[PDB]
Amino acid sequence: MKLWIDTDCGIDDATAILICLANPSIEIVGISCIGGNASLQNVIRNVNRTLKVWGKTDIPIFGGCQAPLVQPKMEIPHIHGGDGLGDINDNDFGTNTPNKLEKEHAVNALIHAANTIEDLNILCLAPLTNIAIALSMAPEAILKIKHFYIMGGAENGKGNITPYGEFNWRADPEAAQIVLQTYPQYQTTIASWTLAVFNSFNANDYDFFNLDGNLVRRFIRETWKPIIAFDGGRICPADPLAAFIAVYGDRAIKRAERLHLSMVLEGEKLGMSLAEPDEKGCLVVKECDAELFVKILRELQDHQ
Amino acid sequence: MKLWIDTDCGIDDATAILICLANPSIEIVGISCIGGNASLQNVIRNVNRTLKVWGKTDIPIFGGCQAPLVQPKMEIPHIHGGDGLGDINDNDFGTNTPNKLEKEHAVNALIHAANTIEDLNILCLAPLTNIAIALSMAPEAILKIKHFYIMGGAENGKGNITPYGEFNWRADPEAAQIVLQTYPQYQTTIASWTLAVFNSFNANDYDFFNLDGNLVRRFIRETWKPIIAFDGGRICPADPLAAFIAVYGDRAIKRAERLHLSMVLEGEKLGMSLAEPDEKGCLVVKECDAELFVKILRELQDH
Amino acid sequence: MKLWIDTDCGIDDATAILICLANPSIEIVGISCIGGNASLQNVIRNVNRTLKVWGKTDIPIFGGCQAPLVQPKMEIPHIHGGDGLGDINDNDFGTNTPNKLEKEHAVNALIHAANTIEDLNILCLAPLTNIAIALSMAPEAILKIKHFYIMGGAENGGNITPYGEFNWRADPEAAQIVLQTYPQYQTTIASWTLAVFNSFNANDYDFFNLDGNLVRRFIRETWKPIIAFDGGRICPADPLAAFIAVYGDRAIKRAERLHLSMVLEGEKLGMSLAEPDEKGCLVVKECDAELFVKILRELQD
Amino acid sequence: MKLWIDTDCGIDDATAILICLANPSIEIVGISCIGGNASLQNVIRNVNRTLKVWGKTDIPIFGGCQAPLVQPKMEIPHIHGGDGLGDINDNDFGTNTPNKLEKEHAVNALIHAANTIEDLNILCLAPLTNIAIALSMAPEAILKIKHFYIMGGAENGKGNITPYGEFNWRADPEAAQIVLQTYPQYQTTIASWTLAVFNSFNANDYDFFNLDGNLVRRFIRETWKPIIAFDGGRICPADPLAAFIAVYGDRAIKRAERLHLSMVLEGEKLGMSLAEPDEKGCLVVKECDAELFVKILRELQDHQ
Ligand SMILES: N=C(N)c1ncn([C@@H]2O[C@H](CO)[C@@H](O)[C@H]2O)n1
Ligand SMILES: N=C(N)c1ncn([C@@H]2O[C@H](CO)[C@@H](O)[C@H]2O)n1
Ligand SMILES: N=C(N)c1ncn([C@@H]2O[C@H](CO)[C@@H](O)[C@H]2O)n1
């Protein structure tokens, strides 16, 4: 399997990247960075930090856009802290190291990946301004991508930013609907924020975000600490779940409904995932295999 | 005066290119293609067709995007024909050559031309999708451009009349909006479709688009036929006027108004645009030298 | 004058229909629906909407087919908006009530119609997939029809391009079936070139803009998208056919008699081979521009 | 197996019907007749004949259309005669009795069959005008058909009545291409005309269409005399092979290629076979078991 990830790396994106790095089956070919949880400038730095702690300081990184397609840029989100990832220290991890970054726009990079990578899967953990522009520039390139595993859009109503919306797609509703009307929805899988709240763990019942023994475990707990509080003491794996499902497939699926989606770019509900059942649409997951998600999360943080 | 054109090459886009080809104070640094009136593929073809009817094949041509950003593509084969260019036969013009194309995206290549090419200008006869996408990828690049000449809108200001439908901005209002909010409107001149409709000619009364003497006359005469007969027998310069002002500077304008354009990306009217008398806005031209414009129409069609 | 109607209900269709609802010498007997401007179900919805805004949906609405006869269902048509009817908010018309649709196929009901409804006329405002398939199954019935009024065709002969024509190019085999089965002599034809030649300039003409009632609202608010799409021009493609079909020769200034065939190969598949012929079609060339706009206005009282 | 027959009653059509009838395991639930070798008037008359000759006429008979879809009737050299089946005299068979036809139109009976009765199969021995119109009017119901067996085409160069195409498809290539593009080619099997020349019999060395005794032998012999003469003296039994495959499964097929097929709807080649090696396409049978074909031809005419 061969995968390309586009991320606005906050805490949970870094954790998801660790998921895909932990699995030897998974060949990460590029990482692409969009603004969201943290500023593009910080998201590059945060992905550097994670590739450093895991020790796979070899994958390429590309700087995409720093804004939405049409909608105006909003105020820097403090949801993930100043540095955008629990505000960790780079002397408290040894991540005080020159970073790595290419010379191609992540749009240019991902288009290249789509033209050249046989059986390329994408894992989209962020606002999709990149992939949307990528589709509009060279659609005949992007549509070669073997499959789309995307995180975003709270379709059951209740979300994170608005009363009933979702952060990543509200950040660029245009970017999302570009994706949904350009890439074939049958070949995409969608992890919604609602699936993130439905599998939300109690903070004092679960411990895999409070261990030590290696820098992976230290990372996990000190990065997840500040957001665990923002979800009112609960673990809302929005991106870790998108990643877990992407890389394991059918032992992550329990009941995922086939649906066609659309975005609402007009009215007060600018950012609502709206959905209509179809068998030739997206497979949006509604339940998880929770015990196995715990048991792989505990795997990657071992030192053995 | 160096210059880069973006085009949905149908009939007026074609003549507008010929305006910029006749005057040897212009250097077309390149031409960029966007699916607009016709499919993208046809737009590239027709760009070749006019460069060949001119005999200046050494201009590079670049593929772009095929649809507008979020809106459906909405080609108009009832107004421009099927090929996009009036359905003219190429064995009638010696235009059955293979097509010169470059291996780079117009978006990369415009970003590159903005960076490497001092005092460059741009004249946009199409939806602004390519330009928006380049402004999103490398805005620091495109904002080196010394001036934008764009064709779109249906302004009123001091005058009180708005008709119905403009093509270029009703097609990708997202693209127009990105442009209007990212490029300095004070560095922008605007030939409205209302400028076109107010500068109509009854094709009976003037003659500039039925003349026979060369290969460029035969080109313009049979290209313009269908859209002329579809616009009411009327010639409404919508693209030609863009080029006519974009090279002839302040020596082709009669009444220019300064308003702060604001594309409406929501509500009932998603194709319309708002504007208000702003000094730091765009250069919306209301009137132009109609008597001097027809003369360049005649003077490019020589032997 | 008893009259069955086939339509792929777009914006033009709807007001072509209202032409017929407003005439007390016309009795529409059925509406059959085809996938043309929008997918079939949108077409059923907008026929229900038109009948509702006019206020008498006791006229059964039959479903036809969702593709041309052999042509690859391609080229999604969003000219007429997503719902086929200019994207009208149903709350503005109170028409978000359930749909009327009969259980018979429009082809079979067509056939039962011509098999029982005497001096029945036909108005075809759409691709002729339905009409032609009935022609193959049961011609001996459909030929009982006393006249065909069809919209479609763009006789290339002016400078209008035949590439704005839609009805016939959408399913050109359908057109051939008809023009090589049903009498060209008992057939009147409003072309797309006819419809452009009788285009109004919008800015100068006002009949498609009023809000004294629910049909004025319906007309204006549905034609907005087609006008802006058509370059600020009103091209009564459908409505002209219904004008002619309802008002006979009183609606015609000029008309030729032309034998007609469909190209079905090569470069111009959906094009019209046309020849002067005593026993040909009554291809209309010009109508009475005034009494048209009169009737358009009158149906808004 | 429960089977629907669509036939343009010529000589071999009739004997293929006899095949579907000799098997106590293949129930006939309808016969939809349609203009082909002979006019509709004939094919109804002649289906009636085959029924009466065999003894079971309880099978409902419906009338399809009188024409092709778009193409005309062109040039017919009475390959099957004036009545379209060897011009037999019904007084030699006692078939001068009344004819049975139903009230419904063969397309409506067709779609109704496909809508209700289970695991239904189609065997088409004619121009596919009926099935084309029934697919257009109701694709969702014809798509309930479990399998299609069609005699048509000549994927190999030459033809039977065309230098390039085969009669059943050249006659209405529009309907042909309709069924090829609207019904799944993977649930379809094809008896090519070139399969009927390859698998042909030197009538000068084979006898199964020359037997006297019971009326089954009388019928087969006296119908097949003329069309054997017209076909150079060979026996090219297209429809009998089609029914051979449909009724008798894979032990009828020795070799087959799976090819995606398509209709030249243009040019000099109008009506011509088009194929391409495709695993999920169609199943064009190349070499049939010539031995068991003759066995079951002899089993039908047995005195028993
Ligand atoms: N735990 C939260 N409340 C939270 N805040 C922001 N996020 C991001 O939003 C998307 C899902 O909404 C993911 O990509 C996450 O990065 N999550
Ligand atoms: N005025 C337009 N925008 C327009 N252009 C084409 N149509 C459709 O084409 C048929 C005529 O051939 C009509 O009846 C409509 O269905 N409508
Ligand atoms: N020309 C011939 N040798 C010939 N003989 C019979 N036919 C009929 O054509 C189809 C063959 O594909 C069959 O189904 C038959 O009905 N044609």
Ligand SMILES: [Ca+2]
């Ligand atoms: Ca994220």
Ligand SMILES: [Ca+2]
């Ligand atoms: Ca243009």
Ligand SMILES: [Ca+2]
């Ligand atoms: Ca119509």
Ligand SMILES: [Ca+2]
């Ligand atoms: Ca046969």
